[PDB]
Amino acid sequence: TTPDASIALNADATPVADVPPRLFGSFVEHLGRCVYGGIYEPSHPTADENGFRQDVLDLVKELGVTCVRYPGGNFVSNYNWEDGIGPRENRPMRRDLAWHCTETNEMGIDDFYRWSQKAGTEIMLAVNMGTRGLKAALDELEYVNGAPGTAWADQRVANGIEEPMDIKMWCIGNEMDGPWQVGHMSPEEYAGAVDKVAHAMKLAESGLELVACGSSGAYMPTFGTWEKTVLTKAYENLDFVSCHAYYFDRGHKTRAAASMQDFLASSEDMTKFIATVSDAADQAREANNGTKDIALSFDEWGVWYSDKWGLHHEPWPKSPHLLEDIYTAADAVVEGSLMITLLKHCDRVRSASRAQLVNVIAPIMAEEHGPAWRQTTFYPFAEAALHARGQAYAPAISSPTIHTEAYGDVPAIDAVVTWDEQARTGLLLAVNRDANTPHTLTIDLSGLPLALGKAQLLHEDDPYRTNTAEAPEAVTPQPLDIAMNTGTCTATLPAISWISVEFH
Amino acid sequence: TTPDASIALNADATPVADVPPRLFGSFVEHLGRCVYGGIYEPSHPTADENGFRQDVLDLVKELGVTCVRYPGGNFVSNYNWEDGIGPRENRPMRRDLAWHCTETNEMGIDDFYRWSQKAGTEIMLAVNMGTRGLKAALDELEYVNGAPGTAWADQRVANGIEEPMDIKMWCIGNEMDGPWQVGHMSPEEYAGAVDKVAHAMKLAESGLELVACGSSGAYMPTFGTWEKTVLTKAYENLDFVSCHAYYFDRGHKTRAAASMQDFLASSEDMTKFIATVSDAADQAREANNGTKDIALSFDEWGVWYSDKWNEQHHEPWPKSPHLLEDIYTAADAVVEGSLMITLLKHCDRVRSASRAQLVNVIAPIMAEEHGPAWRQTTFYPFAEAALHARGQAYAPAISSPTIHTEAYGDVPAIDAVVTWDEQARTGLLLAVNRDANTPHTLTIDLSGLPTLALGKAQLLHEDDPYRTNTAEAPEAVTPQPLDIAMNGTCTATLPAISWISVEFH
Amino acid sequence: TTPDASIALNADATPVADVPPRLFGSFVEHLGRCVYGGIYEPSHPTADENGFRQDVLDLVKELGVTCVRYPGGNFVSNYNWEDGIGPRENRPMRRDLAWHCTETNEMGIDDFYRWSQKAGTEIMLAVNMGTRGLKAALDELEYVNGAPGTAWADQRVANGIEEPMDIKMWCIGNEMDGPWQVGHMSPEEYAGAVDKVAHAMKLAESGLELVACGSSGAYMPTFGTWEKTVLTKAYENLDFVSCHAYYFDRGHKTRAAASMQDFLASSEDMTKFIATVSDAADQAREANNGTKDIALSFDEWGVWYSDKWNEQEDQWKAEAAQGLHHEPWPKSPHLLEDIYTAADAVVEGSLMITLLKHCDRVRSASRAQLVNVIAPIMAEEHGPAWRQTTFYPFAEAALHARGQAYAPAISSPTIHTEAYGDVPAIDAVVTWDEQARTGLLLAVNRDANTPHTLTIDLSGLPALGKAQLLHEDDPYRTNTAEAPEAVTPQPLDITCTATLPAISWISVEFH
């Protein structure tokens, strides 16, 4: 079986950057059953004293998530943060216009902090810029982070949390560009609004890391021009611009081969997407004569099948089944390739949020009063979150090219190498994006300043096979058949495959 | 006469549209004595269990009002709707900057619902866009129309109203264009504000009929461009555009003959005015590649003598003073008769109209403190149209002598509309004589509607056109029986400055 | 001595204007120790029943302040006015973002009203336009000035103040052009906002006199064009436009003679400032075919060494790498407590002269600030209150500049500066009451190392009195808490003539 592809590290290889732990973040929203029926369900036997599903907490810890975006999302644009603080019996029942739901407010910032303490995760808190603004954000900042003595911080102490929450990263609103967003703004309206909010919050606390919300996606007419205006205006007090990208097989219902191969090449779309958002952030620095680069926050990424999209007297539903996609092995392979692209570009991308954490387009599914189980997309993320440490390296890759209808000629193999020169352990993530042809792969890790370890392979001959509640282990990573020959080792990666290989 | 003018419903007669019930709407503002000493007077001998004047309620039923705009008007721009819910003893006393008054808040949305339930009228609810905006609008929308279970809707149940109030038609603020309005906005600001509000409300309840406010009048500098900018931006979540037109005899002090002739032809301004606003509404649809038409909500119309409107350690602001209390002439009544003639002739685009205002306050209904309620001259044309204009509206073929005006060109002396309910075999003619000096005789050829009977035939005319109804003499000017002679084909004489209505089947 | 300079009236004048009493106003902000440990200190040996320091009040009277601006200033941009009303016990403890302090709210509009009653001073009330705006502005207006019988006014009555406070002059926001300001705006954003607020307030009360934010300084990139845009739109309901002018010796750390000479001629910046803002205010009137003039309000002026605060904001910005701060924000710390030199006083004397020379368009001025914070009055913890060098030129002008203001013909040898061109060394004003016989001349010597002698020839006005000299051989000599009266006005030695040493302010009363 002659090798036709090679992953090598040139001698004198300069790292892309240090791996930020924030690259392994996620995002929970008060949407569908992400919170209610997801992280919180008191009736469930696994639930703890606060009502958090322990089986989910186990899988989140296993998933390796470091930081979670909360509480939205479209939800936050008509949300009052005070409705989710204090004793639960005194919290008001409210509406959510975003998703046409009744909100019990059983979960709020109080309880999500308590959840985040158990989970061992940072909170990336989002403020309402739809129906509220500057005053409410400063109020929440004081309540959340304030030393005892001020009236807002004393409320927190009284609420059961004495210590500051230490929320360092903040989202100034949700995506305000979309017509669907409550309180949607023009490019200039949002520019001046983050200008006010960013300046104020930095004045109260200079140690904050602030995110201006970019476009809803690359599909927006204002895309590019949105980022430029906002970042140019508020450059001084910002640290992050957010960018969002979702991917799916367009011909999944017909199981078309062409659309499948397009979908497998989604990384080259993301690479191009990162470059242009980075470019917009560069133009804003240039116009300000600044020294610092505005980092990127990929706070919405993953696979989402979006092709599924008085006069009313009825009460609005509670905890509906929304955006609960079931993922294929193919889906997991592209999410494997997406994380590869994120790591290869972690010099600019310093944060990423896999949207979402539970139930809603998620790597974790929690059934309505049933068991919690790992989706296929769980496994590549979990491997990277646990073992992608130290410095990221963009490896020299010689690969045969596959033709795609959407993106043209694209390399069949793409990869990223991780190295921790004090452990002294490493990691290699690679994908075969070829839909028909397998490829034998050689690896030469010489340039690092080697011994094989646990090697995984995620592949199904039927790429449309999924995990279910009945069969939660129908597709799991299988032991990779790899032979070392000294220095260079070889492995055969089948059509539509993700592998991981740990080394020391 | 002998026949010198004719009204025919032949080929040259054009159908307008089905008569919308909302065209006979009115307007109740917290202004002067429209509410306090108008619809609400606890101490009055006719007061009900809630404090509402029963004698006023009976006249409102007689007037035929179907929908009431509430609570403003300039008043709403500095109003907090929560101040008008719950027990009256718990409600705060406030000041209203608009009309320089102190407001007891005894009447709120709570009470106006109860009043509207008894009156059988729809509520067109206006929200604050001056001192407040989006959040407050959504809060009130929930409190009013939300099902039990949510905090705001559970407040409404705790306040003694279990059922949702089902308010369907909403005004996003008031006339935000005028520099007299609290929180007045540029065309760009209001457009951006309405876009947000209209979207968020439709997202909450897709069954809403939302009204964006237009110019305060045709006189405004930003007229035309205002509606263009606002409607183009917010089109997808809008159902109505509001327009306002008040009219009066400019030389009423000197009893000028020239001014009286302009005032009598005021409908010709209204015709042009509607077309201009219809154009702005068409642009918004065409610019957004839409098929839904933005309807016109004439939420302020009527005769108002605005040239009189003075005015334009401390002291407490007055409670319910005597403001905008116009006593109407016979001429004022025929003008409003012709205005409703214009509205009905253009009820294809104008799907809502509101005569400003209902009680005491440029009104057809007057109510004296601890006294009786009586009809102004303007009551009678409105009440006839409101109760008998049903089915299809027709613009009939009019051949008429030309009367000369100053503010407009040479105008037809006679203007008319014909209502017709084909299935019920019953119709109505409403016609007017705009001539200030010479009488005219009409031929009424009703043959053409899809051949005999005539019913109540009324004529509102006074030899002295400046004659008024007052408190001491409530019935000095009233509609008299009309001399009609079917030969056929009917014929009737109209003296200078008169309004007529003839029922037929 | 040799006479070379001439201060004289051209036989037939023709004054600038009648001197407005509001020109001698000051400014109290919830900043540092201006309020707490300044005007308010309940445990102080001179504290009254309300807890106001009498020794401070005595010096306010002596200073001749007529109108005091409250409560801000940068402070007001993130301030909720209801937090400072009602019973002290139940007032919430709050953050101030502007100065990074925790605020107890022991002082509020209820209390400052009582202070202003005790002082005999008018109140110039500033409202939040940063975190808040229109609705709160109208709420405070009703609370403060409404007749009893409305919810907001009844609260004031219940809080111990039955009668309306009768606050005429209001500042709609603070320094909204400055990028340091909470909720800072563009020219268009503020124009729209001030138009809404000014109209609504004047609709509630015709008798109100409303101030729009102008430029925070002449250096501002939006200078001139800010005023033009803002005033053009909101013209009808505005009465004033605000001007802010701070000055200091940029090379005081080195004692550089070049920076000192630039600093002594700081009045030249103010002259241009006045000219440019007036022209902007003029074009707004004629754009609206208006009949009314917008007067100028120099509501923040004086000497302030802002490099100390500028270095604090840099160190705070560079502290971002260390992480988040858990420590509670300080209560009434020592902030902006500049100790004034003999030179600083002479500069303020000349600024007052320029203000008086242009009091035809500048009908109000507020010196920043009243106590402890860049102040003529310094007040020590549980101890004495004393006069700074800048106290004495203000007091004299405040207590004697009455009647009409005259700009006399000046002929003096010019001097060279880096910041400005060639400027006259001597600068002076004449104030004169025709009914009757008094009578004040204020003059300044701006030369840093050459003494001048001048001739005084009144004549054209339709025996001398008390004459004073503010000069020290060391122009860096200062009044301190230890020796508070080291720099005091000394008797002047004096058609009539007098000798003015390098860097000196003169006051001479006549009848």
Swiss-Prot record, chain C:
A GO CC term assigned to this protein in UniProt: cytoplasm
Active-site residues, record numbering mapped to chain: E175, E300
Site positions for Important for substrate recognition: W304, Q369
pH dependence (UniProt free text): Optimum pH is 6. The enzyme retains full activity at pH values from 5.5 to 7.5. After exposure to pH 4.5, the activity is reduced by 40%, and no residual activity is detected at pH values below 4.5 or above 7.5.
Record key words, sorted: Carbohydrate metabolism, Cytoplasm, Glycosidase, Hydrolase
Key word Isomerase present: no
EC number(s) per entry: 3.2.1.55
Temperature dependence: Optimum temperature is 45 degrees Celsius. The enzymatic activity decreases significantly at temperatures below 35 degrees Celsius and above 60 degrees Celsius, although considerable levels of activity are still detected at 20 and 70 degrees Celsius.
Record's subcellular location: Cytoplasm
Subunit composition and interactions: Homohexamer; trimer of dimers.
Entry function: Involved in the degradation of arabinan and is a key enzyme in the complete degradation of the plant cell wall. Catalyzes the cleavage of terminal alpha-(1->5)-arabinofuranosyl bonds in different hemicellulosic homopolysaccharides (branched and debranched arabinans). It is active with sugar beet arabinan and wheat arabinoxylan. It also exhibited activity against alpha-(1->5)-linked arabinobiose, arabinotriose, arabinotetraose, and arabinopentaose.
Protein name listed in UniProt: Intracellular exo-alpha-(1->5)-L-arabinofuranosidase
Lineage of source species: Bacteria, Bacillati, Actinomycetota, Actinomycetes, Bifidobacteriales
